[PDB]
């Protein structure tokens with residue numbers, strides 16, 4: 001289970017439907033993808049050695065995205081999906097592009113990062129809303145079996161991942177835009193000296209700072225929420241979620257900046 005709150009007992013089972021897929025794709029930082037711009041700094045026409053939380057060059061990813069219909073499995077809320085956060089993660093996220101009429105919509109899995117996932121501890125949540133990325137860090141009363149839904153196509157379950165009837169204490173709450181037409185989003189999430197850091201991009205490029213947050217405590221677990229729809233499967237549209245994740249480590253990178261301040265190259 002994630003949290004401990006009994007939000008539902010509708011259509012829960014114990015079926016071993018899947019395990020996380022391992023990517024054929026591997027981390028290649030030679031053009032800056034898998035690196036980040038350093039905080040609010042601008043570096044112009046230079047190379048720096050910088051020590052930071054980076055993926056290993058040549059590492060695989062685990063796809064932690066889970067697509068449901070009516071049922072959820074209790075085995076989806078355990079190892080290997082419920083994951084130790086350690087130092088942090090780099091993720092590559094497919095923006096799942098859906099059409100209701102001719103109009104386009106963007107869906108992808110929410111990620112939650114936390115420790116015990118109960119309302120005496122802060123949980124960070126990163127969730128898309130069709131071109132808006134909502135991010136929060138709150139004392140959420142997380143469900144036992146949390147999940148999100150398609151807003152675009154229908155869902156035979158309601159959205160249910162926390163049960164707070166009035167808004168919990170939040171250290172952070174902010175929204176960021178992303179290009180709805182992109183094929184991929186990328187994120188870095190890490191912790192250093194009790195401070196959390198987040199970065200994103202909506203292109204094959206170095207990730208840009210979202211926010212940083214002092215927690216004092218260690219985050220210890222992260223989990224990628226199941227998403228339920230009457231869509232996004234082989235018998236209806238052949239479309240899929242993908243939420244690829246690879247671990248970070250304290251690591252030294254060369255970063256090359258051009259005269260505009262764009263990272264053009266990097267080395268592990």
Ligand SMILES: *[C@@H]1O[C@H](CO)[C@@H](O[C@@H]2O[C@H](CO)[C@@H](O[C@@H]3O[C@H](CO[C@H]4O[C@H](CO)[C@@H](O)[C@H](O)[C@@H]4O)[C@@H](O)[C@H](O[C@H]4O[C@H](CO)[C@@H](O)[C@H](O)[C@@H]4O)[C@@H]3O)[C@H](O)[C@H]2NC(C)=O)[C@H](O)[C@H]1NC(C)=O
Pocket residue numbers: 004005006118119141163164
């Ligand atoms: C912060 O997070 C915590 C932890 O999740 C929340 O605390 C839980 O809150 C819920 C909702 O109030 C509590 O659930 C309720 O517990 C009552 C007592 O349980 C005992 O008695 C029942 C029989 O009545 C036994 O079966 C059980 O084993 C216990 O011995 C129940 O009486 C309540 O029953 C109602 O709900 C159930 C389920 O929907 C129905 O079947 C019943 O008919 C009835 O409608 C209910 O189960 C839970 O116990 C709390 N846990 C703890 C550890 O405190 C906090 O609420 C949250 N705080 C904030 C600010 O959000």
Ligand SMILES: CC(=O)N[C@H]1[C@H]([C@H](O)[C@H](O)COC(C)=O)O[C@@](O[C@H](CO)[C@@H](O)[C@@H]2O[C@@](O)(C(=O)O)C[C@H](O)[C@H]2NC(C)=O)(C(=O)O)C[C@@H]1O
Pocket residue numbers: 013015017018065066067068069070071072073229230231232233234235236
């Ligand atoms: C994490 C995971 O394993 N995810 C897969 C999912 C689950 O294994 C399945 O939900 C059972 O999970 C549990 C916990 O029991 O199966 C999916 O495929 C289904 C067949 O397996 C799909 O074709 C569905 O077939 C139906 O017969 C039915 O009800 O399952 C009719 C329904 O309308 C139709 N769904 C549509 C059209 O979206 C799905 O989607 O649900 C593809 C997902 O990648």
Ligand SMILES: *[C@@H]1O[C@H](CO)[C@@H](O[C@@H]2O[C@H](CO)[C@@H](O)[C@H](O)[C@H]2NC(C)=O)[C@H](O)[C@H]1NC(C)=O
Pocket residue numbers: 129132134173174175
């Ligand atoms: C961040 O984005 C979300 C999603 O668009 C906003 O949530 C909406 O807020 C209004 C407030 O009146 C509600 O009526 C809607 O029902 C909410 N939508 C959803 C899907 O929850 C949120 O207001 C935005 N801003 C901030 C600072 O969180």
Ligand SMILES: *[C@@H]1O[C@H](CO)[C@@H](O)[C@H](O)[C@H]1NC(C)=O
Pocket residue numbers: 006008009
């Ligand atoms: C969860 O709540 C439902 C609805 O009240 C109840 O039927 C079910 O027995 C509960 N299960 C547990 C494990 O508390």
Ligand SMILES: *[C@@H]1O[C@H](CO)[C@@H](O)[C@H](O)[C@H]1NC(C)=O
Pocket residue numbers: 016018019075
């Ligand atoms: C689930 O199925 C996979 C594939 O057969 C297997 O590797 C795994 O050990 C099974 N059990 C669990 C609890 O994951």
Ligand SMILES: *[C@@H]1O[C@H](CO)[C@@H](O)[C@H](O)[C@H]1NC(C)=O
Pocket residue numbers: 045259
């Ligand atoms: C960029 O740096 C190189 C090496 O020092 C130098 O030759 C070049 O003139 C610089 N250009 C600008 C625009 O700073």
Ligand SMILES: *[C@@H]1O[C@H](CO)[C@@H](O)[C@H](O)[C@H]1NC(C)=O
Pocket residue numbers: 010156157158
């Ligand atoms: C979803 O929400 C609606 C409206 O509150 C409710 O009627 C329904 O019972 C809920 N649950 C499911 C599984 O649809």
Ligand SMILES: *[C@@H]1O[C@H](CO)[C@@H](O)[C@H](O)[C@H]1NC(C)=O
Pocket residue numbers: 179180181182183
């Ligand atoms: C949005 O994404 C598409 C596909 O990558 C790209 O062609 C388009 O130029 C992008 N537009 C903006 C405003 O970023």
Ligand SMILES: *[C@@H]1O[C@H](CO)[C@@H](O)[C@H](O)[C@H]1NC(C)=O
Pocket residue numbers: 234235236237238
């Ligand atoms: C999904 O793709 C397979 C392979 O191309 C095809 O056989 C099947 O008919 C497709 N189904 C849908 C709903 O597109």
